[PDB]
Amino acid sequence: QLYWSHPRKFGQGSRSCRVCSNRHGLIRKYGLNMCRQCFRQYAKDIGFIKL
């Protein structure tokens, strides 16, 4: 059974988000995995304020 080809070790498919596994929108490299929509609501919980 050839189940897992195309090993996906790079690029866009290797970036899987912590929130909803979003892969069309980008995922930032800040020690962070968000969807840029829910990051707005969750920044005040993870420690970011607007100032």
Binding site: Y3, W4, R8, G13, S14, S16, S21
Partner: peptide, 9 residues
């Protein structure tokens, strides 16, 4: 978790 086998094992 949700990751069923397709990107990685």
């Amino acid at each position: 978790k949700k990751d069923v086998h397709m990107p990685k094992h």
